[PDB]
Amino acid sequence: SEKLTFKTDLEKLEREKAAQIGVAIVDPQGEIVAGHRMAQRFAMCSTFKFPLAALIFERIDSGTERGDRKLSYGPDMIVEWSPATERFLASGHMTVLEAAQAAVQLSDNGATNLLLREIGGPAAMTQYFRKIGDSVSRLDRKEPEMSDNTPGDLRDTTTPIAMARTVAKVLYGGALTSTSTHTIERWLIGNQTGDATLRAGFPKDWVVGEKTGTCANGGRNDIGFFKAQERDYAVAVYTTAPKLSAVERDELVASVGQVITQLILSTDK
Numbered sequence: 589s590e591k592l593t594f595k596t597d598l599e600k601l602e603r604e605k606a607a608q609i610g611v612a613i614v615d616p617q618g619e620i621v622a623g624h625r626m627a628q629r630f631a632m633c634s635t636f637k638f639p640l641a642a643l644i645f646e647r648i649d650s651g652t653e654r655g656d657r658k659l660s661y662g663p664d665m666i667v668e669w670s671p672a673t674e675r676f677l678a679s680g681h682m683t684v685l686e687a688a689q690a691a692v693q694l695s696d697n698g699a700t701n702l703l704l705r706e707i708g709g710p711a712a713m714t715q716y717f718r719k720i721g722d723s724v725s726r727l728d729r730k731e732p733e734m735s736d737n738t739p740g741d742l743r744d745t746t747t748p749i750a751m752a753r754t755v756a757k758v759l760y761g762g763a764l765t766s767t768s769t770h771t772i773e774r775w776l777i778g779n780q781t782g783d784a785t786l787r788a789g790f791p792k793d794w795v796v797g798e799k800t801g802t803c804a805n806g807g808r809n810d811i812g813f814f815k816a817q818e819r820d821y822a823v824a825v826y827t828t829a830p831k832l833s834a835v836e837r838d839e840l841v842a843s844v845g846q847v848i849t850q851l852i853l854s855t856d857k
């Protein structure tokens with residue numbers, strides 16, 4: 589019955605906020621716990637920066653990259669929303685690790701694009717999704733254009749179920765070494781951009797980490813993990829609410845987190 593309540597609650601949010609809400613919750617092996625519009629395409633927006641960091645950690649794990657390697661750049665790398673990149677510009681570089689951390693924790697666009705430059709562009713991000721068994725998620729463009737979220741555009745999209753399982757792959761499914769996995773987990777927990785989204789709607793005793801995304805045309809997303817009740821979960825939430833304000837879209841995602849909470853609390857262990 590609890591899965592029907594979940595569906596009913598989300599439909600009520602969609603109706604009342606004029607929104608479309610895609611959700612997938614999976615266990616550590618990627619088995620479905622619950623979902624809504626799980627196979628509908630949504631723009632990834634900044635949510636892909638978590639997988640990009642994973643991509644980088646895999647290179648590190650395989651001996652093809654080091655975290656301390658200096659990536660040089662000039663003023664042409666500065667793009668809208670590049671807080672760290674702008675601070676490090678005079679010094680002349682950011683390291684692989686600094687860039688990756690800024691990408692994940694600040695959503696820094698310049699840092700993101702510096703990493704894309706290094707790995708051979710958006711095609712290499714897509715290549716990595718394929719390699720960890722995600723046939724759906726696709727990166728086509730750098731930031732900020734990838735965040736355009738033009739209706740009907742298949743570029744730079746995922747589905748909630750594909751992305752949730754990619755999260756689970758990265759955090760639980762052995763995609764990265766123990767040490768790399770732990771590092772990225774703590775980055776998700778200490779994210780500086782998620783305080784008003786999903787983790788605002790989860791119980792304060794749950795351990796949560798996530799990566800947010802904001803799209804043009806009313807996109808607001810949050811992907812990550814939570815640990816309740818001894819039990820680990822991966823979650824992906826994508827919403828589109830063209831007429832809401834930015835604060836209202838954060839509230840919408842927090843509300844989704846409340847609806848998720850009620851579902852998990854009503855799921856037998």
